[PDB]
Design an enzyme around this catalytic site. Structure first.
Site, mmCIF file in Angstrom:
data_model
loop_
_atom_site.group_PDB
_atom_site.id
_atom_site.type_symbol
_atom_site.label_atom_id
_atom_site.label_comp_id
_atom_site.label_asym_id
_atom_site.label_seq_id
_atom_site.Cartn_x
_atom_site.Cartn_y
_atom_site.Cartn_z
ATOM 1 N N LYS B 196 0.895 -1.256 -0.090
ATOM 2 C CA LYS B 196 -0.130 -0.178 0.082
ATOM 3 C C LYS B 196 0.809 1.262 -0.003
ATOM 4 O O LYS B 196 2.013 1.424 0.201
ATOM 5 C CB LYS B 196 -1.022 -0.093 1.294
ATOM 6 C CG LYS B 196 -2.123 -1.065 1.169
ATOM 7 C CD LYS B 196 -3.080 -0.930 0.190
ATOM 8 C CE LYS B 196 -4.517 -1.592 0.451
ATOM 9 N NZ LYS B 196 -4.142 -3.195 0.459
ATOM 10 N N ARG B 231 -4.067 -10.095 5.191
ATOM 11 C CA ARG B 231 -4.230 -10.015 3.774
ATOM 12 C C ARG B 231 -2.916 -9.644 3.132
ATOM 13 O O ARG B 231 -2.547 -8.482 3.260
ATOM 14 C CB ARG B 231 -5.361 -9.056 2.980
ATOM 15 C CG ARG B 231 -5.828 -9.406 1.585
ATOM 16 C CD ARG B 231 -6.475 -8.151 1.125
ATOM 17 N NE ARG B 231 -7.590 -7.774 1.888
ATOM 18 C CZ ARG B 231 -8.721 -8.546 2.001
ATOM 19 N NH1 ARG B 231 -9.102 -9.528 1.224
ATOM 20 N NH2 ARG B 231 -9.780 -7.925 2.383
#
Lengths: 247, 250
Positions: B196, B231
């Site tokens: 991210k 995740r």
């Protein structure tokens, strides 16, 4: 707190990295130092003994060259003969593997106004203890006191993970690392690619243990350690960039 | 003990569990085999219509491994076909705002993930990152959607703060630092910071595919805060890191 480096002081307000450069079986080692410096290493840690005393050929040549980068350099040697030469060349930190049990090493560091690292390892190394944490804490503190009273400006404590210690011992020391940090002296740890990391992460190849090493080191940082001896400098700088912003 | 319901079995959250990401957007059985071998507890498949021809054929093949499969999709049509095929977890990409998804989860007896995002449209959500108190507002949204889903028949709800969804770095940081407050809501918490922007920003890594070390660091912090579901893209790296972390911190 701060770490004295012969002619400069390094603040430990953030985690500092000692980039390892193993000279055990050159100009192809100087670029690796410049490489680690570029990756974020605060101190370059050079060691030549896994050897005979003339290990000076393995170290000094590289040491002098590496010192030209202007970055602090730590030298890992047991022999006072090698240390003295390294120190008069400009060494900033004396990393004594034998926990400064050698009075000559103590005298040397005090005479050159250089901090010394006291690492724990069995007197000899049998991994047998009545209470490893209590015993390592006692040894580290006692050796530090001897060095400081002898003139050494500052002492860095290193639990010596992997040295005469089985997994159970290394785990115990890590879990109570805060107690070693509570002795006041700066604490240094190095679990990079060590057997402990392989045992816990299930990674057969020592060269592929970066993830477990980073994990162990972040845990040490959480415990208060601000000095890490590492092989993968970049990986640690990236992980610390995240960790230090969150914790 | 705390557990995660997965359609026909419960997964113990006595240790961190990993949802390995398998993105099928612009064999699959092989990679799935690899991720399972690497330590993935759940396989997360998302193809975010034509979304069916790309996902369904693969989903059916992957399901034969016997490992729980999570499906990510905004379209109920795709979700229903995925659930009818046997998917074990319904992951959201809109915050479970669609009542149709809620109904499918309850009808198929599967748990559903509620991920926070200010608005469902991915193209406008960065225009909605102006929270007065992001932690409080995210907690309120998650708990509300959780109550709604549970009251409608959903067996269990997994809360995900939605890192990187309509959130500035300041917001992602605040949520991470107070993640324990989300865990305190009582539902299993799932976080996904793999590759991210937050990781790129804090670790100084521009290439998304080279952010494993910062991702592992953020995830270990989440675990310290109480999160037991991650995740991730790099399954092996996380299994290796957790082997050390969980042995120490526990």
């Amino acid at each position: 707190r701060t770490l004295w480096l012969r002619d400069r002081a390094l603040d430990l307000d953030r985690v500092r990295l000692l980039g390892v450069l193993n000279l055990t079986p050159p100009e192809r080692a100087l670029e690796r130092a410049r490489e680690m410096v570029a990756e974020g290493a605060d101190i370059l840690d050079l060691g030549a003994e896994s050897p005979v005393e003339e290990e000076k050929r393995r170290l000094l040549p590289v040491l002098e060259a590496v010192l030209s980068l202007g970055v602090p350099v730590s030298v890992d040697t047991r022999k006072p003969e090698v240390a003295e030469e390294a120190l008069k060349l400009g060494a900033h930190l004396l990393n004594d593997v034998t926990g400064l049990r050698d009075e000559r090493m103590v005298a040397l560091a005090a005479r050159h106004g250089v901090a010394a690292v006291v690492m724990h390892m069995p007197v000899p190394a049998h991994a047998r203890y009545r209470d490893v944490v209590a015993e390592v804490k006692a040894f580290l503190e006692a050796q530090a006191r001897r060095a400081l009273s002898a003139g050494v400006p500052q002492v860095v404590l290193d639990p010596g993970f992997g040295f005469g210690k089985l997994l159970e011992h290394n785990l115990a020391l890590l879990r109570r690392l805060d107690e070693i940090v509570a002795l006041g002296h700066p604490v240094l740890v190095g679990l990079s690619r060590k057997r402990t990391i392989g045992e816990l992460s299930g990674v057969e190849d020592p060269a592929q243990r970066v993830h477990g090493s980073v994990a162990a080191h972040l845990f040490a940082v959480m415990k208060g350690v601000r000095l890490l001896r590492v092989h993968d400098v970049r990986a640690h700088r990236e992980a610390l960039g995240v960790w230090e912003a969150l914790y």
